[PDB]
C-alpha cells in the first residue's frame, strides 16, 4: 500500500528549562516519525519532566514499532486499539499511554498533510481559536516574584493566569491568593492549582477561605485517583474542581466523569493516547456538558482546545513550541490553531539537534 | 551507613516457553541486584509476557537506580514512597510499577538475610503453606488435549485446576467446562479465567450456565478496569468473582474492593509494587474479608500467599522456579514456603546466562 508504515524513527532529547519549576529544570521531548511506502512522513510527540525518557524510548523501539512496520498508516484507529491490548499486561497507562501517544499524533500528522487539513479542523472544526491562560507560577516564588511573573503574563497580552498552592502553611496560600486578585483586578480570570498535594480537608479548608476572591477552578486539589475524595471536596465547597493530565485511561476519565464532581477536564493528548485518545476523552467529557480543556504542549492543543470550542488551553511552561516553526500564536488573548495541514506542529531540528541523547 | 545502597544491578533475560500459551512463546525477566556498603547483597525481580523488558529496565537504570544510590536500605517504605511520586508522571501503574516491585522486592530480600528470616515469616507468618492450583490451560486447545493436561496436573500431586474460557462462540466454554467437572470428579476444586475478553451481558449468560458444575471462581470476565460491569455481573450471577493481576495500583485495588464485589482477589507481587506494595493489597483485601491470592511467580508467592493464609496460589505457566536453585516444593497439594532467609528465591544464575539480552 502507498500508506504502509515503512519506518519508524523515535528520538530523545533533554531539553533545559530556563527557569526552575517547582523540582524541574529540563523536560524531556520524545519524536516519533513515520515513514510511509510512498515517501510520506509525519511526525508526533510526547514529553516528560525528567522521568521516563528512555523508558518511552525503549518501549517505542522493542515493543511497539517493530509491530507497527508494514501495517497501514490510514487505519488509525485499528492502529490505535492494536497498541493498547499489544502492552496491556504492562499498560493500563503510564509509560504505555505516551509512547501510544507518540505514534498516534505521527498518524495523524500524516493524515492531514494526506487531507490536506489542519488538526483543529481534522477534530471537529467548531472554531480555530480558544481561551488561553498562563500557568505554572511556581509554590516557591516569594510574593513579590510571584506578583511581578503575573504582571508579566497579563502584560505579554493574557487575560487569563493560573498559580500553585499547596504550602505547608495554609495561610501563605490565602494571602497569596489575595494578593494575586488585588494585582490583576476584577476582570482577569484566576485559577489554583495544589498539585494533588492536599488533603481532602485541607482542599475544604483552603477552597472556603478563597472562594471570595472569585476562583475560576481549583486544579487537582488532592491525588487523581481520589474521586470520592474528589465529590467529596466538591460537596463542601463553591469553587469548581479540575483535573487532569494525570489521568492516562479513558475508564479513569469514565471514573471522573462518574464520580469526581468536576467543573473543568484536562486530557493531555501527550499522555491519554495522542490525538485518537484525546478524542475520546474530549468525546466524554463533552457528553457531560463540562468544558474541555488541556494541559501542556499548547503548539498541539491549542488545535483541540479549538475543535471542541468549549474549554481553556493552558500556556504550560515547559516551553516546546518555542522548538518548533511556530512558537504559540496568541491573538487578542486567545491562541490561534495554525492552518498547515497535519498536526500543526514542526520541530526546529537544527535547533534541538544539541539536545539529543542517546543510549 | 552499613545499609547504605551502594550499587544495583539489573538484568533482562528473554526466556523461551516450551509450549505456547494462548500467544507467549517467551517470558521477560527482569532481576535486580542491590548491594550495600557493607558488601550485603539481595536480589529481586519482576516479569513480563515478552513485552516491557527493555522498557522496565531502562527506567530502573536511568530514573530509578541513580536515585536510590546512597539511601539506607533499611528505610524501605521510605524508599517505596520515594519511588511513587519520583515516578509519578509518568506512573500511577503501568511500566513504573514493575520497576519498584524489582527494586522493593531486592530490599525485602536484603532484610530477610539481615534478619535471619523467611519471607513468609516477615509478612506475617501466619502459616508456611498455602492452597494450590493448577492455572492456565490453554484456550486454543482441542477438548482432548485439555483433558489430558489436567490429568497431568492431577496426577503431578495437586487438588485444583483453572482453565482458559473466553471462546468466540460460547457453546464451546460451556461444553469444556462440562467436560473438565465430568473428568475430575466432584471433589477437584475448578477455576474459570477468562482475560477480560467478555462483556458483561456474554459473562452472565456464561457463567448462568456453568454454575451447575460448581466452579470456585470466574476469574477476570470482563476488563479489569470496569468495576461497575464487575459488580453488574456479580449481582446477576451465582459465581464468585475473581481478579486481579493487571490491578497496579493500590487505589485500584480500592476501587475493587468498594464496587466489584470480588470473591477473591489475585495481588501479583511482581507489578503492583513488590512485597511493600502486595502487602498493603494484602492489608485492604483482608479488612473485606476476602480470600488473598495471587497471580504468577510462584516461587515467590508462596511466600506471601502464606502469610496471611486465606487464598490460594496459583502455579502460574510461567516457569520462573525452574530457574531458581528451589522449583516449587509442594507437599500434600499445598505449595510449602522456604525457611531460607530473605524471600525464598535464588536464581540459578548459570542457567540463565545464555538467556540474557542487551542494549
Ligand atoms: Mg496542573
Ligand atoms: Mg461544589
Ligand atoms: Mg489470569
Ligand atoms: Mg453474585
Redesign the interface.
Known amino acids: 500500500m502507498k500508506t504502509t508504515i515503512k519506518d519508524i524513527k523515535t528520538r530523545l532529547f533533554k531539553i533545559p528549562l530556563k527557569e526552575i519549576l517547582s523540582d524541574h529544570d529540563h523536560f524531556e521531548l520524545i519524536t516519533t516519525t513515520v515513514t510511509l511506502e510512498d515517501g510520506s512522513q509525519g511526525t508526533g510527540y510526547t514529553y516528560?519532566?525528567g522521568?521516563?525518557?528512555?523508558?518511552?524510548?525503549?518501549?517505542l523501539?522493542?515493543?511497539i514499532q517493530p509491530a507497527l512496520i508494514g501495517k497501514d498508516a490510514t487505519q488509525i484507529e485499528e492502529i490505535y486499539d492494536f497498541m493498547e491490548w499489544?502492552?496491556?499486561?504492562?499498560?493500563?497507562?503510564?509509560?504505555?499511554?505516551?509512547a501510544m501517544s507518540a505514534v498516534d499524533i505521527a498518524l495523524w500528522d500524516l493524515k492531514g498533510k494526506r487531507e490536506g487539513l489542519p488538526l483543529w479542523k481534522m477534530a471537529g472544526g467548531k472554531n480555530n481559536t480558544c481561551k488561553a491562560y498562563c500557568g505554572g507560577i511556581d509554590l516557591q516564588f516569594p510574593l513579590e516574584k510571584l506578583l511581578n511573573n503575573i504582571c508579566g503574563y497579563l502584560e505579554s497580552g493574557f487575560n487569563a493566569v493560573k498559580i500553585k498552592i499547596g504550602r505547608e502553611n495554609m495561610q501563605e496560600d490565602i494571602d497569596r491568593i489575595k494578593a494575586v486578585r488585588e494585582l490583576i483586578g476584577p476582570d482577569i480570570t484566576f485559577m489554583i492549582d495544589a498539585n494533588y498535594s492536599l488533603t481532602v480537608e485541607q482542599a475544604i479548608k483552603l477552597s472556603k477561605a478563597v472562594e471570595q476572591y472569585d476562583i475560576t477552578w481549583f486544579e487537582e486539589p488532592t491525588?487523581?485517583?481520589?474521586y470520592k475524595g474528589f465529590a467529596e471536596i466538591a460537596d463542601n465547597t463553591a469553587i469548581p474542581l479540575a483535573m487532569g493530565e494525570?489521568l492516562?485511561?479513558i475508564?479513569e476519565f469514565g471514573?471522573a466523569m462518574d464520580q469526581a464532581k468536576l467543573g473543568y477536564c484536562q486530557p493531555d493528548a501527550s499522555?491519554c493516547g495522542g490525538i485518537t485518545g484525546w478524542l475520546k476523552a474530549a468525546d466524554l467529557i463533552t457528553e457531560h456538558n463540562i468544558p474541555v480543556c488541556t494541559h501542556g504542549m499548547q503548539e498541539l492543543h491549542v488545535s483541540l482546545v479549538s475543535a471542541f470550542d468549549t474549554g481553556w488551553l493552558e500556556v504550560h511552561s515547559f516551553p516546546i513550541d518555542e522548538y518548533t516553526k511556530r512558537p504559540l500564536v496568541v491573538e487578542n488573548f486567545r491562541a490561534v490553531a495554525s492552518n498547515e495541514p497535519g498536526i500543526g506542529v514542526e520541530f526546529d531540528w537544527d535547533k534541538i539537534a544539541q539536545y539529543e541523547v542517546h543510549?
Open positions: 516528560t519532566g522521568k521516563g525518557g528512555y523508558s518511552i524510548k525503549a518501549m523501539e522493542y515493543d499489544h502492552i496491556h499486561y504492562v499498560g493500563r497507562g503510564g509509560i504505555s499511554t505516551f491525588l487523581p485517583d481520589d494525570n492516562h485511561t475508564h471514573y499522555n543510549h
